Design a protein around this motif. Structure first.
Motif, mmCIF file in Angstrom:
data_model
loop_
_atom_site.group_PDB
_atom_site.id
_atom_site.type_symbol
_atom_site.label_atom_id
_atom_site.label_comp_id
_atom_site.label_asym_id
_atom_site.label_seq_id
_atom_site.Cartn_x
_atom_site.Cartn_y
_atom_site.Cartn_z
ATOM 1 N N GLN A 184 34.355 46.885 42.476
ATOM 2 C CA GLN A 184 35.210 46.520 43.606
ATOM 3 C C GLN A 184 34.652 45.237 44.198
ATOM 4 O O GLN A 184 33.445 45.011 44.132
ATOM 5 N N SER A 185 35.524 44.394 44.756
ATOM 6 C CA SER A 185 35.128 43.067 45.209
ATOM 7 C C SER A 185 35.947 42.626 46.400
ATOM 8 O O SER A 185 37.065 43.100 46.622
ATOM 9 N N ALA A 186 35.382 41.680 47.141
ATOM 10 C CA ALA A 186 36.101 40.979 48.183
ATOM 11 C C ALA A 186 35.605 39.541 48.239
ATOM 12 O O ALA A 186 34.410 39.269 48.111
ATOM 13 N N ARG A 197 43.216 41.740 37.194
ATOM 14 C CA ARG A 197 44.532 41.492 37.776
ATOM 15 C C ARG A 197 44.409 40.434 38.872
ATOM 16 O O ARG A 197 43.776 40.683 39.902
ATOM 17 N N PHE A 239 31.460 39.501 47.762
ATOM 18 C CA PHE A 239 30.875 40.824 47.973
ATOM 19 C C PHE A 239 31.274 41.728 46.814
ATOM 20 O O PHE A 239 32.452 41.858 46.511
ATOM 21 N N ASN A 289 41.794 36.391 46.712
ATOM 22 C CA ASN A 289 41.457 37.790 46.886
ATOM 23 C C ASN A 289 41.099 38.380 45.533
ATOM 24 O O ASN A 289 41.151 37.691 44.515
ATOM 25 N N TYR A 290 40.708 39.652 45.529
ATOM 26 C CA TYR A 290 40.275 40.316 44.315
ATOM 27 C C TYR A 290 40.511 41.799 44.443
ATOM 28 O O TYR A 290 40.525 42.337 45.544
ATOM 29 N N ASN A 291 40.704 42.453 43.301
ATOM 30 C CA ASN A 291 41.023 43.867 43.247
ATOM 31 C C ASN A 291 39.887 44.654 42.617
ATOM 32 O O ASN A 291 38.853 44.083 42.250
ATOM 33 N N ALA A 292 40.088 45.972 42.531
ATOM 34 C CA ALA A 292 39.176 46.883 41.853
ATOM 35 C C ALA A 292 39.501 46.963 40.369
ATOM 36 O O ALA A 292 40.669 47.050 39.991
ATOM 37 N N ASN A 330 38.005 48.575 36.330
ATOM 38 C CA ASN A 330 37.089 49.382 35.534
ATOM 39 C C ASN A 330 36.673 48.547 34.338
ATOM 40 O O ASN A 330 37.523 47.992 33.619
ATOM 41 N N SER A 332 32.817 51.083 37.636
ATOM 42 C CA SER A 332 33.806 50.929 38.687
ATOM 43 C C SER A 332 33.407 49.753 39.561
ATOM 44 O O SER A 332 32.406 49.805 40.277
ATOM 45 N N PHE A 344 30.647 45.602 44.698
ATOM 46 C CA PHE A 344 30.297 47.003 44.848
ATOM 47 C C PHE A 344 30.579 47.667 43.510
ATOM 48 O O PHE A 344 31.732 47.778 43.116
#
Lengths: 234, 234
Positions: B200-202, B164, B217, B140-143, B145, B198, B219
């Protein structure tokens, strides 16, 4: 389950939320589609009352876990689809760290061919200067593990997890979720082994959409638990 | 910039990576498309050498920031597109907390109609049973900056951030990224004000894909800094 047969293709989704947080009354409408075979959700939300008086990220969990991908070896643990098409009630209390709480009750069920999530949400005890009523949250979202267990007394499930909300001062505020789901119908449901949903998200915008809105992308797959719900510091 | 005109529509993407971590070699090939107007990326990666010896999440940042959405009021700060089509060199050192480090060098540029990212990566000082070589990271992956500033001496930018990574024991491991980008051409580039992306990923899977693989993915939208790159503890 027979319910799971309803999710083998792309299913249209409708979401309606009526909200009242600290006396700020708002409404959100959403629409999109779900692809449970891959665990994908694509949803667009509009605040139909104008400007959302709380941060969009605080409403993400409230605004359809029947669209999670359950791998073949885990199909026997998919409560959510098993309760369909009659649906389930999903209720939460969400405690925001050092601030107020949301309480929600939703009905999730098929209305014709559309999966519909209808929600009432109330928030209270929020600080006017806090991250919620002060709208100090970054517009983003992280990955979370959503932990599910059987709740035999209710012929349903209990669900627990913590959301991590990134704040504009660099801090992170936890939202402690207590969730319960119960079948609406009297048909048989699957009472699952304790497991979790690996949930990933991203919040985006349409730059040409003038209304206050959220484009939500979700990616969710069930998995076997390897650790507890809280962060291990070592 | 003129290079920004190349990103107004949907652009095809090819990615090629050769890596060597503690002597364990792999190659990864990727393809998909980017939509800078919305800040969206969709990419599929395959390991062409069989089993990937490290976690997919560790390679996410290595495996095209020219696809970030820069709002109109920030378009004067978009270095990445301004370097196109000649492209730029992206170099990183990534320090994994209490473990080894990756070093990478990539060229990102247009080859025909396709935006291509070609990378060489070397990893060293890893623990054979740490989270990387022991493959203990959640998928998994987080958001995050991503902080950008001008680097005048190099007519380029320096970029810094912390990733993280959620670990299977419930802990989180930081990956400290030191990044630099320099243009290949000697045509004019935009040297930006200090700002951030900013991101964001999945990470997802194709259940029917049998090769070791990652569906990514992304963003990404540029924004004005409101805090430092590290988590503020309250």
């Amino acid at each position: 389950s027979k319910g799971a047969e309803l999710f083998t293709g792309i299913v249209p989704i409708l979401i309606e939320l009526n909200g009242d947080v600290n006396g700020h009354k708002f409404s959100v409408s959403g629409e999109g589609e779900g692809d449970a075979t891959y665990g994908k959700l694509t949803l667009k939300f509009i605040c139909t009352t104008g400007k959302l008086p709380v941060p969009w990220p605080t409403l993400v969990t409230t605004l359809v876990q029947c669209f999670s991908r359950y791998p073949d070896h885990m199909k026997q643990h998919d409560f959510f689809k098993s309760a369909m098409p009659e649906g389930y009630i999903q209720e939460r209390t969400i405690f925001f760290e050092d601030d107020g709480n949301y309480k929600s009750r939703a009905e999730v069920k098929f209305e014709g061919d559309t999966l519909v999530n209808r929600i009432e949400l109330t928030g209270t005890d929020f600080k006017e200067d806090g991250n919620i009523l002060g709208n100090k949250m970054e517009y983003n979202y992280n990955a979370h593990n959503v932990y599910i267990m059987t709740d035999k007394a209710k012929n349903g499930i209990k669900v627990n997890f913590k959301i991590r909300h990134n704040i504009e001062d660099g801090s992170v505020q936890l939202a402690d979720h207590y969730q319960q789901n119960t079948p609406i119908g009297d048909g048989p449901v699957l009472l699952p082994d304790n497991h979790y949903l690996s949930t990933q998200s991203a919040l985006s915008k349409d730059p040409n959409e003038k209304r206050d809105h959220m484009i939500y992308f979700g990616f969710v797959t069930a998995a076997a638990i390897t650790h507890g719900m809280d962060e291990l510091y070592k």
